[PDB]
Symmetry: D2
């Protein structure tokens, strides 16, 4: 299903394990560039062709690096021969109160099972 390796549009890779309990655990790779991922997903989705909702978070700190920022992906898994996870993300960095207005970026990413 979701368990496995996913490739994003521009290079990044993640390995995720989708637990029976609805937990998402894995690693995201931008080892200097490997980071822990953690999330949740709908473990009892609809079969009417709806995708499966999920989200996950990466804090960009590891034993070598720290960008003082975090990304959260919200989106959905669509199975099939053309399996994909379509997401929108929010990147939030630590800032002072005075730069909190410019603290968050928004984007989107598509992950597929090959590439």
């Amino acid at each position: 299903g979701i368990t496995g390796t996913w490739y994003e549009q521009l290079g990044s890779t993640f390995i995720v394990t989708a637990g029976a309990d609805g937990a998402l655990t894995g690693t995201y790779e931008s080892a200097e560039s490997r980071y822990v991922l953690t999330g949740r997903y709908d473990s009892a989705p609809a079969t009417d062709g709806s995708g499966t909702a999920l989200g996950w978070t990466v804090a960009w700190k590891n034993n070598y690096r720290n960008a003082h920022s975090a990304t959260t992906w919200s989106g959905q898994y669509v199975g099939g021969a053309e399996a994909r996870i379509n997401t929108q993300w929010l990147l939030t960095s630590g800032t002072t109160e005075a730069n909190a207005w410019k603290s968050t970026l928004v984007g989107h990413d598509t992950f597929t099972k090959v590439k």
Copy 2:
């Protein structure tokens, strides 16, 4: 600092534990109880910046399932009033044709008071 009980600027409540190397665990509020999990910057800057964090809640518990998930992205702020300022994304499972309307966006502030 992050560990403890927080209240939403409307009325929800969440209980968090922050693990020494960046894990966020706890629950977002009986039938209204859901698991949350996330990560945080466990070695933030010392310049007065806040602490970047995120978490996810999938809206399924042993009683209900909305077929959707929400992620909060933000930062913890130490001050007179410690706060967590977030922006959030709620994605619902949809067929492909309705994907364009699958995701809500909003923001929220949590405080330990109230």
Copy 3:
């Protein structure tokens, strides 16, 4: 309700005229910090107590400066005592293909008449 001067929580200011077929025109703000705004709003909202949908755009260029960016605000007008415009915004900066992933900030602002 919308025509007039609005102040955002952060110090900035905008003067708008809401025309009769949904046009929004005005300036966002000394001269060096004034910029043209243009937008649209629902000139016939429901009367169920719902807010009035609107939006507008500002590119950050004037005769004196050019940040090579633009902001869009999407939100609603809520009249009455504390009349307010509640918005979410996107700021996009022109980037090369390579930095496009970090081209768009998101946030929120609330405008009041005082």
Copy 4:
């Protein structure tokens, strides 16, 4: 290269004129009035051209009590395109304001897919 007729991946069409002073005027497709701004003097460094516009979903046939704003940048190239992120807000009561806004992304090209 902004002036012209553009196509979005889901079939939507927008006709727009880019004027002298950074104004954007046109129609989104029945049809809805659009207006926006663009950077009339972009960087030389191969950066894209920042831009944005708005549509309120009311015309003479219907009104959805909503508005969408697209924020993005134009990239010339052998196949020009406009990459955008968008927010769609509906009028709602206070109690429902929390779900009043949708967020998405849209790519327009001068060729119809």
